[model samples]
Target: AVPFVEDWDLVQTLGEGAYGEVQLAVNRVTEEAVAVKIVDMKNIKKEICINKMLNHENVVKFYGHRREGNIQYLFLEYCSGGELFDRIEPDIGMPEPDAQRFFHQLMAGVVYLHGIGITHRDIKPENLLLDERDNLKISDFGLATVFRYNNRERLLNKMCGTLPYVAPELLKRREFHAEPVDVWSCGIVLTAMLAGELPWDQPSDSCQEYSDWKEKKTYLNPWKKIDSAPLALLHKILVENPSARITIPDIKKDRWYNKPLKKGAKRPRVTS
Candidate 1:
């Protein structure tokens, strides 16, 4: 049994989501602040397994979990800066350099999660939080699950995650590896950070732009919408084919990512 840490006074409302309201809390004993996710007891089991297994700087830190009759209390790291969802405003995307930093952090978390066999089905701006320094942390494991088995391999057919960020394979009803889906979501996150809007709502035949890229037929590249230098790299990340899409290591090693940022370049102005 897990020891219960009690009497965390409520500070403020973090946000409301499908899971429940996350509230800012301060420990009564240590006088430290933490984020407490109050979830229904029925939906607490999977979140428990997913978060407890995660231990990476880019991912949100989970302290512990406790339960009362019908509710579960999940104590987490308090990110004072709040959600990335609030910062990404339409027409006011983050600067390329800053977005690069956030993208790198997001990839690091994804790499760690994949390496440990945990697939975060829901990866979106709303699930990303920032600390005081503006460093990003992946959160909200309610829809996350462990996909890999100790056996040879497995294919996940569950169609989950935000619609705009979902992978093409999922929409196509194809059995796919968790890595590909996550990589696709990463591309969407990068696009949103750079363009401040999703290139398409769906990544399938229904979306002409996505379909063009899917068939390699000449069409307006969505990367053109963003003032980014890594056009080729972005194309690779956003490739319509999961098998051909660049992997995390490939993304990390891209020359554009390795090169130094152009000095005296004007950073993209963003809003709070």
Candidate 2:
């Protein structure tokens, strides 16, 4: 017979999403803590497979899973850690090296995702978590999908994801560069981390505020509000034309990369 961690007391409800809820659980046997995401089985199996295959420092790990009746539950690594948004409230943004470190990790994760034909799709502060070390881990792969290089540039039929952080092209209800769209969202996240404010954002998904709904255009410029932050990088990320969006290689060569990224840009790398 196998030992079990199921039936662990639910400490508190961590949070909930469209598909399910996450709660902090306490293991009665080992007296340990873990986060259990109880989502519909059909909706999360794919994500678990992706997590099983992923071995990145900047991403969360899936521990184990269980099925109870119609509802399925996933046992995730307990993170006494906090969300990036929560931390940013008092500090606005982290130190330069901290930001750079996160950027490097984020890039490294993206690079890996690209390799396996998986895209994070949703990259935002809310979706990021910080372990005890303050290391950034990308989470929420429910919106994640697999796509080939060129095949990703088409509009997806489904309307999904949080508004302010969603890619501009995705709103067209047509295919667009999926990976590039992720990069664009990264820039938005970077803005929030660096400037502590949302750029060109109207706070809602209302078509009128986002852009001319009839024409499907949202042309608010948040970059202009940035005092002296890197606007060029921002521009490249926010390029309305998804086809012309900045590629990964282009980002690697930018001035941003020249500086020592977290751990002095000389940290040991994680291998798959």
Candidate 3:
């Protein structure tokens, strides 16, 4: 369907991506704030796929799309609290409990998506948004994919997402599971928050980067970085074997995420 460009007011910029710019705007009739993600249809068809099957509380809602010539605008649920990327300002990272809570929520949503046969290929702090009440929402499902891997199996494939969070098997371009890669990305996001820095920097190539991360647990942050690191806690979520890592059941039983972290979250789950 075509998108309606004239009905909303462009209010503020969210961020710039390869496709185009995303912004927070207000709808003319509802006067409600919403995020408008505009993309050149040809530039990112993956994003279109993401919007097609995406509907999760952790993910920004897909309000519908509009077009003006070659321009495609995706009207989404506006989340204005701020980006998690901003939360790591300067070098003052997030506290352990808070970071853990965010990780749990992210995984919870990811597990749900995986159960529904969707894989969020990209998982990072930049993609996480916080509402005014400190509720964490995992945004940017543009890189998400719908897969048919339900039974236990190995998914080795060429790496598609960012390098830092990519799993080893993916870099090898073998049939690698998508869920593990998503978990890897989430783990890195948490590490960055707790350390205020990337864990490893020497390995420039994805191949070598994957190698370094495999056995770099005791590896030090070259910059002597980190304040209150929870590496032990992170490894459980970051393990290379997506199957061997924290499963949905284990995540649900985790102590760090026993209760809802979002403010005023009603009992029972919001998403199915």
Candidate 4:
């Protein structure tokens, strides 16, 4: 059993999600602040089980959880800054170093999750949060699914995730390896961060827009303008075939991704 929510003083309501509400709460004795996510009792066990299985700097910390009748409260690390969605500008995307830094952090987080057999079905800018220091923190595990550790042959057929960010295999409603889907989504997110806009409303190879974009023309002209190093990485990541898509672990070692971090960079590598 976890501690009661009453132990912490509620400061303010953070926001609401499909599963529950989040609020800022402070430990009365320790005077420490934390984000308390209040989810339905039905999901408490599974959510907490997954939360306990993970503990990484790039991941939002799950301190403890408590059940209060029909409701359950999850104590978590507080992120003063808002979602990554607020940072990206559609007209003027982030600078190369900024984009690289963000993408690296995102990959690091994803790599860690995949390494631990957890697949974040939903990977997009909206679910990524920023801390006071602007470090990327992966959050909202509502749609995340876990597979048996060391089971690489396992395939999941569930159709869940944002349309634009979903992998082509998922769009086809075919049974797909969970990890590759996340990598595909990461590629889309990387493109958005660099291009300052989505590559396409829907990223299917069958779509004429996708074909044009892959040929390095039309709306994807901005992507062509980026340096070859990162562009190549995107090419591999955005492959239409899930089996051909670059895995998260491989992404950490990519030339463009492994580039040395410049001094005074806000989010240093929590890279694995």
Candidate 5:
């Protein structure tokens, strides 16, 4: 009854997370490479459901799922270029045009997810993968959930995500709007792409960098280094008040977002 084992051959272990391990595999018929996530059946249903509903160039393609006893096999697109986190250099970041290109792709994926009423609660560099063509692909939907159903929006109470990239509102209150939280996380991601370091460990008064940022100290280390155009957009997206945070539409309209990528710029080379 377990057709997956007969259909594909496991190559090697790719990585492991809290849920389970992912392995590289190749199809028997076509020899196509893929990432097979092996997880306990109980913990994979929600992820499979969400991933199955997603179809976008920037989102990882979910080929299919198979269950064998207590284990579930999820076949996903193979991103050979590896994690976006690996491409980012600490304190140095990436070139502006390269960061802009990736950020645009990231936003495209987020917008698509939002359009379909899904919120990827865990949006960070580690969850972002790159294809052979260096295209950004959003992966890892274990924390994703439906925030809208039949055109009605709902507030989510669960506080789940990487601490550094989580919205301040999620840390402050129990119930929060889902979309704005994603926007806040995207802002953190953008900062990481630009500064190669996190603005703060957590968006709280305890973090001095966040406190200084809250006071609009643009003269601070990372903030001072960022150009005015993108910094202006960051100011809007990183707002502590989710109600005041910039939406996708507004972000798309912003000058920096609409700015054209520089011509003939090659993708940055990843150093070991």
Candidate 6:
């Protein structure tokens, strides 16, 4: 018998990733649905360790894991609303209130992860999932790692994550701080939400958009598309110097981030 068969049954394939495939699964007893990420045992250790330690409303919930032969079945909270990427419309981002709501939730999750000494190296729209109520949940810990223990922090050297969302330092330096990289990715995510497109293909000099930004040319496409309010925060977070990038606490204090949502404005539905 397959492991977890008595408790859960695989329904259908949901998506595929470098680690393995994710499938929709239903509980045999209660008919509760969950996402089962089937991964090779060897590649699952870090994910399991990191995910099991996380507990936040804005973070995907890790139920448990079952093993069969060389396969590991990781049961996780099924986000029915789909990826945040689907909600964004190219060159015309979501409504202002909607973007603010999602960004707040994303920041909350990032704050929690950083607080736990963990760094999610990849933070983009694709990896950010939404629940039935449109609450953003940070998912996919495959590229995450512990950058701190006790009171001592360590630097990470491995260059991983999507090109557009990756911090510039990761492309230039051999060893870089992990938390700042996440912050940088968060900036890219915010820009995508606001402008409905990436600011640049990559943060490297070869990317004209990035180079223009470095030269203080704010009249570029996406940057020009972003409003002054969130644009200010983006400038602070997307700083090329990791040390100068705004920290989570300061980000929380940013005027735009703390701006009150419009009264009685209904949450917008995710339109394909």
TM-score for each prediction? 0.88, 0.77, 0.78, 0.86, 0.93, 0.92
Off by over 4 Å in 4: 1-6, 40-44, 150-152, 218-225, 265-272
Which candidate number would show the highest lDDT if scored against the true structure? 5
lDDT of 1 by residue, 1-272 (tens): 32345667998988886667899998777778999999865537888888888889889999998887788889999999888877886855677777778887898899999888888988999889999878899998877877776844578988789889998888886688888889888888888887778877788687877766666543354555664456667778877678898998989898767766534435698999
Residue 164 lDDT in candidate 6: 91
Clashing pairs in 5: none
51-169 per-residue lDDT for model 2 (tens digits): 77766777777887777777887888766777887765432565655766677677777887777777787788888887877777888787787666454433355555667777776
Give the distance in Å from residue 223's predicted Cα in candidate 4 to where it truly belongs.
2.2
Tens digit of per-residue lDDT, candidate 4, span 55-117: 888898888877768888888889888788878888566777877777878877888898888
Worst 10 residues of 5 by lDDT: 1-10
lDDT of 3 by residue, 1-272 (tens): 33553577888888897878998888676678888898866625676766767777777678887777888888888777778888874555766567766776777678767877778787778888887666678788766766655665445464577766665557554576676677667767877777777665422345454355565635555223533235544657666666688755665565545544435445687766
Rank order (by lDDT, best first): 5, 6, 1, 4, 2, 3
Give Cα distance to truth, residue 229, candidate 4, Å. Answer: 2.8
> Which structure among the candidates has the greatest TM-score?
5
Off by over 4 Å in 2: 1-7, 40-42, 90-92, 149-157, 202-229, 261-272
Q: After superposition, how far is residue 52 of candidate 4 from its true place, in Å?
A: 1.2
Per-residue error at 29 for model 5, in Å? Answer: 3.7
RMSD of each: 5.3, 6.5, 6.4, 5.0, 4.4, 4.3
Q: Per-residue lDDT for 54-131 in model 6, tens only?
A: 899999999999888899989899999999999999899888788989988998999899898999988999999999
lDDT of each: 0.81, 0.70, 0.68, 0.80, 0.91, 0.90
Per-prediction tally of clashes: 0, 10, 10, 0, 0, 0
